[PDB]
Structures are given as C-alpha cells and as structure tokens.
Design a binder for this molecule. Structure first.
Ligand code: A1ACZ
Length: 385
C-alpha cells in the first residue's frame, strides 16, 4: 500500500514538482489550485505560514517575510562569496549562526530564524501533502533531485530537509540524470551514449553532459549561468513597456512599485502566450494615475528584446563540450528542461548550433525532472520490497 509507494520530487530554485509512477504511467500531481508546479516560496504572516502559490501571491505586500531561493543557500557557509553576493539582492534578512546562514523573519508577531534546510523542508512537506491528497493515503518514500554540481555538503543538507519533512529519502539523484531517465535514455542497450541536458529555468541556466554506459551514468561536464533564467526575459519586457508608457503618456512609472509589479506579472503571462502565438496582448486596468494600459507585442519584438540573452546560452554549451572533450556530432541526445525552453527562438538557436538536430521536448520541460525521479523512485521501492 503506502510502504510499496514512492514519489519523485523536483525541488527547484523557483518551482517544485511532484510525480508518482503507478499503473505503468507517470502522473505529475496537480496542487489544490490545479497547478502541476508549485512556487518554492514560504511566507510568514501575522496569522499563518503560507507555502507555494499563496506565498508567491502575497510577496508584494510582505517582501521581508517571504522566503525564496533557499536552494542558493542550502549546504553553504555564511562566509561563502556566493552567499555574501546573493544576500545583497534578497528582501529578507540572512544572519550568521556559527558560520551557517539562517533566514530571519517575523512570524505571528515574533522574530524567528530558520536554516535553509528547514525552509526547504516546508516546501518538501507541501509536495508530500499534494501527493497524499492525490493518492488517498500518506506516502513517505521519495527520490529528491539536486543539480549535478551540488557537492557532498549540499546533498547532505537536501537529504536533511527530506528527513525534517517526514520523508524516507531513497536517493538524492542529479537533475540531468532524472531528465535522461524520463526519456528512457539508459535503456538503449549496450554502448556509451552521450547526452546533453539544456536546462533553462526561472532563475538559473545549466548545461550538463552525461555518458550512459550500460545503465551507469557519468557526468562529463557541467556549465552555465546561475543568474540567467526566465525572470530576466520578463524584466526585458517590463523595460520595453515602461518606455512605451513614457512615449504614449509622457509619464515615468518605474518608481511606482505596484505599477511595476502588475506590469511584471502581466509580462510573464504575455511571454508564455508568445511561445504558442505570434502576438500577445496586455490588458491592465488603471496601471498608473488611472490610465489603462491596453497594448500588444509580437514574438519578433520579444525576440529582439531578449536577443543577446538567448545567444548567451550557447557559450556554456560550447564550454561544456570542450570540458567533456566532445565535438557536436559526438552527442547522441539533446534534452530540454525548464519552462523557458518552450521559447521557440531558444529551440531554434540550440537546434541550429547542433546542425539541425531533433530535440527531446515531448515531456513538459518543467516536469521532466520530477517525471524521471518518479520513475527512479518506483524502481528503487520495488527493489527494497
Ligand atoms: N510557455 C512558456 N514560455 C516561456 N516561458 C515559460 C513558459 N512556461 C513556463 Cl513555466 N515558462 C517559464 O519557465 C520558468 C519556470 O520553469 C518561468 O520563468 C516561467 O515564466
């Protein structure tokens, strides 16, 4: 029953996803709002603790007490230059507890501080409750994914987040390995198979090269940009619409925090529409000083606005190929991961770089990692008996 059941969790920087392998198929489980992915956000309010969509929806009104990006801190020391650099950009407080970072917030009128693993355990608890509501019984066995470049300390702190959340962690697997499992790339029989995973998410970009020699996975190279993702494309749209508002009304909206946020969320939505239509419309009632902002943007203009960012994704691809000592024609499979890989220009650039090659993209790219983890969790729980 419950003891023979196992889930796969993609614990992401900005979004998390949970899957279950049953009756010969993977089911990516929808949360209580019907979304197949949940924001990795935890809000602390005057009355409650919010996790996911409800936490992300009130981020504007409560920025000091809304924690996100815990994955950027997990397993790291406070003195780490990555932690020191990131802290300058977060609206929440990060404190030092014996060279270990803690996030400090106000909760039910009291000052409370949490380790990154305690923050990640609240996200993991939500993913566990989403699976339990779908299954009708508690599931406790889980496979949790991490980036391929995570060291031993980051992997141990992720397993600890799993323990705090009440999960029996069957294994901590690499995100590009879960993605290759999702496509069944470890079941092509004998002979070394070279796979490139192109992972473009909300806030990070990762390129991984794996060799799969008879079921055995080996990471040959990792490359990328930890501060490149979908949110940079939203911000380029925001800047365009702020300048268009200035041309139409001779008014600068950039300082009005509410106007910029409403425009940002509308830009994110318009960006997603541009992945399946050649134009998208913005319909913002009373954006600034009672002025409605009813406009549109073509996919061509959007591609121009983000042109330099899209092209920059090819430098880590070349870098990973040189570190792996492989030429382009030596790569057997190209796998797309992350919601931003749905952008047609991104796909065209990667396909032209690999000389017109087909891309593995039939599995929802923001769900492929959870899909593979769910597959591995079923195999692992079956062997445990
Ligand atoms: N259809 C889409 N076209 C473009 N970007 C998309 C799309 N879907 C998602 Cl999710 N994203 C973005 O992926 C990230 C989450 O993985 C977010 O930045 C989201 O906007």
């Amino acid at each position: 029953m419950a003891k023979a059941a196992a889930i796969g969790i993609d614990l992401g920087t900005t979004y998390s996803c949970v899957g279950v392998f049953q009756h010969g198929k993977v089911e990516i489980i929808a949360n209580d709002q019907g979304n197949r992915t949940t924001p990795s956000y935890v809000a602390f309010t005057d009355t409650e603790r919010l996790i996911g969509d409800a936490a992300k929806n009130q981020v504007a009104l409560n920025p000091q007490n809304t924690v996100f990006d815990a994955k950027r801190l997990i397993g790291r020391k406070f003195g780490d230059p990555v932690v020191q650099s990131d802290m300058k950009h977060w609206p929440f407080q990060v404190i030092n507890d014996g060279d270990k970072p803690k996030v400090q917030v106000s909760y039910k009128g009291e000052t409370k501080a949490f380790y990154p693993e305690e923050i990640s355990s609240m996200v993991l608890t939500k993913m566990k409750e989403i699976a339990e509501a779908y299954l009708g019984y508690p599931v406790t066995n889980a496979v949790i994914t991490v980036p391929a470049y995570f060291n031993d300390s980051q992997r141990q702190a992720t397993k600890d987040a799993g323990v705090i959340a009440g999960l029996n962690v069957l294994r901590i697997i690499n995100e590009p390995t879960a993605a290759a499992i999702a496509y069944g790339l470890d079941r092509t029989g004998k002979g070394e198979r070279n796979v490139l995973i192109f992972d473009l998410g909300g806030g990070t970009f990762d390129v991984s090269i794996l060799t799969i020699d008879d079921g055995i996975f080996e990471v040959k190279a990792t490359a990328g940009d930890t501060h490149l993702g979908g949110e940079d494309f939203d911000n380029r749209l925001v800047n365009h619409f702020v300048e268009e508002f200035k041309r139409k009304h001779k008014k600068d909206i950039s300082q009005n925090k509410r106007a910029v946020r409403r425009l940002r969320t509308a830009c994110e939505r318009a960006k997603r529409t541009l992945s399946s239509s050649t134009q998208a419309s913005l319909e913002i009632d009373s954006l600034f000083e009672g002025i409605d902002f009813y406009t549109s943007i073509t996919r061509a203009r959007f591609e121009e606005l983000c042109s330099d960012l899209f092209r920059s994704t090819l430098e880590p691809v070349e870098k990973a190929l040189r570190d792996a000592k492989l030429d382009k024609a030596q790569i057997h499979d190209l796998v797309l991961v992350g919601g931003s890989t749905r952008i047609p220009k991104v796909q065209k650039l990667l396909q032209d770089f690999f000389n017109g090659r087909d891309l593995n993209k039939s599995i929802n790219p923001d769900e492929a990692v959870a899909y593979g983890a769910a597959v591995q969790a079923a195999i692992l729980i079956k062997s445990t008996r």
